[PDB]
C-alpha cells in the first residue's frame, strides 16, 4: 500500500459532507462544486464544467453541473474515472418512515467516490510525465430519480454520454466508483460491468487480490445495477466497470445505510476507502507508465 493515502481520501469525504447535502439546486451543491473544481485545478487537472438545464421525472428543473477534469488532454489514449457527487434529496429508505421527507449526508452515496477520485487526482498532480490521458468525471444528478422509472437516474451521465465535452471523445476503459466507503462493503461483479468489460473487471479484481483486498473485492456475480457506467457503455462504447457496494444477500442489495439517515460520516471506514483507492491507483499505475 504505497501510493494512495486513505487519510487524505477520508478527509475529502468529510469536506463534501461539511457543506451540507449536495442536493441539485441548493446552495451547498453550488458551493461544493466550486470547491470540487478549485480543488481539482489545484491538483494540476485542466478542469472543464458542463452545465445544462434538465427536467427531472417530477418536473423539477435541475441546474445539472457535470465536472470534467483532464490530465494530458491531447493524448489519444485515455483512462476514464467516474463518480456522482450529488446527494439524493431524501432518505426514502429510512427505517423510520417519518424521515422519508428529510435529508441525509450521503457520505458514502456520493461522498466516497469523489473522495477517492480526489485523492487519486492529487497523486496525478505530482506525476512528471504520463503516457495516457486521464479524465476524472464527476456526474451530477445521478440520484434524483424515482424507483419505478429507471431512466430518471444518471441524468448527468446520460447527458454527458450523449454530449461529451470533446468531439469524438474516447477512452480505453472506464471505472465508476459508487459507494466505496461503507464499513464492511462487498464489491461483487456488477452484471453489465462483467458483460461489457470482462478483461477490465478481471484486471481490477486481480489487482485487489494481489494487494490482499480479497476480503473486499469478491470474485463472484453480484447485481445488475443501472449506474452511471451504463449510459457510457451504450452511447460512448467505452467498456466500463462499477466498483459498488452491493450484495445479493442484503435486504436492499445495497448496504443498509443506503438512502438512509445512516449514510453519514459515521458509516465510513478508512480501510474500505484504502482498499478501493489503493486498488484503482495501482491498476492506474501499470496502465499508464
Ligand atoms: Zn443513491
Residue numbers in the entry: 41 to 329
What does the paper say about this structure?
QCs belong to the family of aminoacyltransferases and catalyze the cyclization of N-terminal glutamine/glutamate residues of peptides and proteins with concomitant release of ammonia/water. Glutaminyl cyclases (QCs) from the oral pathogens Porphyromonas gingivalis, Tannerella forsythia, and Prevotella intermedia represent attractive target enzymes for small-molecule inhibitor development, as their action is likely to stabilize essential periplasmic and outer membrane proteins by N-terminal pyroglutamination. Crystal structures of the enzymes from P. gingivalis (PgQC) and T. forsythia (TfQC) reveal a tertiary structure composed of an eight-stranded β-sheet surrounded by seven α-helices, typical of animal type II QCs. In each case, an active site Zn ion is tetrahedrally coordinated by conserved residues.
PgQC crystallized in a trigonal crystal form with two monomers in the asymmetric unit. Both monomers display a compact architecture of the type II QC α/β-hydrolase fold: an open-sandwich topology with a twisted central six-stranded β-sheet βA–βB–βC–βD–βE–βH (with βB running antiparallel to the others), surrounded on the concave side by helices α6 and α8, on the convex side by α2, α3, α4, and α9, and closed on one edge by the segment βF–α7’–α7–βG. In contrast, helix α7 of PgQC, which is shifted by half a pitch compared with its HsQC counterpart, is preceded by the short helix α7’. The single-zinc active site of PgQC bears a strong resemblance to that of animal QCs. Replacement of the third zinc ligand (HsGlu202) with the shorter PgAsp183 results in a minor rearrangement of the main chain. Of note, the indole ring of PgTrp193 (conserved in bacteroidal QCs,), which is C terminal to the “insertion loop” and prior to α6, occupies a similar spatial position to that of HsTrp207, which forms one edge of the active site pocket and has been shown to participate in substrate binding and catalysis. As a result of a different main chain position of PgTrp193 and resulting side chain orientation, the active site is much deeper than in animal QCs. Access is further restricted by (i) the loop following strand βC formed by residues PgArg128, PgPro129, and PgAsp132 (all conserved in bacteroidal QCs), (ii) the inserted loop following βH immediately prior to PgPhe294 and PgTrp298 (both conserved in all type II QCs and that presumably play a role in substrate binding), as well as (iii) the extended chain between βG and α8 that shows structural variability in TfQC and in mammalian QCs.
